[PDB]
Symmetry: C2
């Protein structure tokens, strides 16, 4: 019979998707396959009927000993939390057996999506953050910020303070209150503005939904690593002044015309100026942080192979634990 | 609760998806919205790890009084029937509420896909075939050919003979035998070659999987309508010599470099030479067949709005009849 496994968010959590390790492990493998160019990843088509209101199709194939195909079909409505009391992002991931191309799994996407994006920060930090760093900064208190924080805390037990800013001060206060209770020994500090938050972080993670940059280069401590997960938060000067700029995929960043492409089109950046793709750091191909004064920027577009790899890892754990609903295709 | 309806192929059939009318009705509306440019349809990204071995993401939004978003994620392995005794094509359609962008349905795609492609031929024939035509030609005896035939027979009761060719003579014989039993009064004729089949058809439908053209212009009877569903079957001269060429979407056909784009890039065709987009015939914007000697070619790329419209029609019928499996997203 042609069957598929359906995994809702509860099943995904039950199968290990509520903690970072599975994502770190999945993405380490996927980033390795990426550095060996053993994947295929078409440009993501956006469906706009805000730069946030859209549904994005993210297909990819990851080659290798355990190859997998699939697509993340993920949408957002800026309005959902405020007007409808629903999460902003929603979606499904479909997995496909590359032997037959048949769909084999239908899974909830939003948890997986935000967890894999947090694992991006984790893996980058393992390579690019100062060793033993004590101060973490989160900008933006949504579900992205929440998974970013959860994952950093799981992966780096030396974090002692967390600086937190959201321009909706209310969202900030609720976020700090819950986390302060979740982790009583860690000092969570709600800051009065983004500058205060950024200025204090040895690792800074941007998790907002604006498209105007506010982060200025001189807010950055010497030795800082900034994981610019929400893309548009960082002023252009930062790209020009950081000692190292890392991306997930050069060809994606250099599409017309994202911030890096605009920099290239004037005479201000080039593939030559780029320190690394992330996968290249994973493989030990190119060094990561080399001293403790370097200010280092990661600017990831976000890649389908990350979603499909993660979802696939979780699917196998679910199958092993008899989790999920078996559906018939026919 | 965030819930979705899962409809497998059996449910889709139970909900009316096993007959043409629902597709004709869905596509008439979608083609109307297309002619009024009330849709958004990104270029389809192909995932190739044969021109047939791939998975295609087909996202679209159809505006209008009952707007709907969604994606068809549909794959093929040339090999599946021969090596694995599985259907070549497989896939899922996901539907999305454009209010929130949340997914609302997960449905089996392959039946819907082939049925909507047959409805394309039906609707085009209503506008472009000679009225009362008696002779139908099917080239290719797969599931595409099968749905094309089923739908023409349902929609045109004046068909008296069906000329059938498949280059795998065995596939042809099995197809004719089953259909001869299904419809005993109609003469099904297995032909010795494609030329014999094409030469006899007042309506000719191409349903093969080759990428080399064999159909020559002078095989075509005066007054013929050819629905070139499998795209590559028709020699270039046909595009140049037909009295009318109709497409589903000009911008899609003129992408670099399909047959029509190659014609445009040399000096041999232009948007000026094109008689119509299909939607324009539906709206009564541009006349269809104007006399009974005209030889008329339809060359459809295939469009996401057709899949999503059809799936949406079927979803509503399913909801009304309590068909399908309710899934939780969370």
């Amino acid at each position: 019979n042609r069957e598929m496994l359906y995994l809702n968010r509860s099943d995904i959590e039950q199968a290990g998707g509520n903690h970072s390790q599975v994502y770190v492990d999945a993405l380490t493998e996927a980033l390795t396959a990426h550095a060996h160019n053993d994947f295929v990843q078409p440009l993501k088509p956006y469906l706009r009927q805000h730069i946030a209101d859209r549904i994005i199709a993210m297909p990819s194939h990851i080659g290798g000993e355990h190859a997998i195909s699939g697509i993340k079909w993920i949408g957002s409505k800026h309005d959902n939390p405020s007007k409808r009391n629903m999460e902003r992002a929603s979606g499904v991931i479909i997995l496909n057996d590359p032997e037959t191309n048949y769909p084999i799994a239908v899974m909830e996407a939003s948890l997986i999506s935000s967890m894999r994006t947090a694992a991006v920060s984790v893996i980058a930090a393992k390579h690019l953050a100062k060793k033993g760093f004590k101060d973490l900064t989160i900008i933006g208190c949504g579900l992205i910020g929440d998974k970013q924080l959860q994952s950093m805390l799981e992966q780096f037990d030396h974090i002692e303070r967390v600086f937190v800013y959201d321009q909706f001060s209310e969202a900030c206060a609720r976020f700090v209150d819950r986390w302060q209770q979740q982790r009583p020994e860690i000092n969570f500090i709600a800051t009065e503005n983004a500058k205060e938050a950024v200025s204090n972080g040895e690792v800074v993670i941007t998790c907002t939904v604006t498209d105007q940059p506010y982060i200025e280069y001189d807010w950055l401590q010497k030795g800082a690593f900034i994981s610019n997960i929400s893309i548009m938060d960082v002023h252009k000067e930062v790209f020009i002044k950081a000692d190292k700029v890392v991306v997930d995929d050069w060809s994606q960043c250099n599409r017309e015309k994202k911030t890096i492409n605009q920099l290239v089109l004037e005479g201000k950046f080039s593939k030559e100026a780029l320190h690394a793709e992330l996968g290249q750091l994973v493989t030990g191909d190119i060094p990561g942080r080399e001293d403790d004064d370097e200010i280092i920027l990661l600017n990831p577009m976000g890649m389908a192979i990350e979603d499909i790899s993660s979802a696939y890892f979780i699917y196998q754990q679910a199958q092993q634990q008899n989790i999920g609903t078996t559906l018939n295709l026919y």
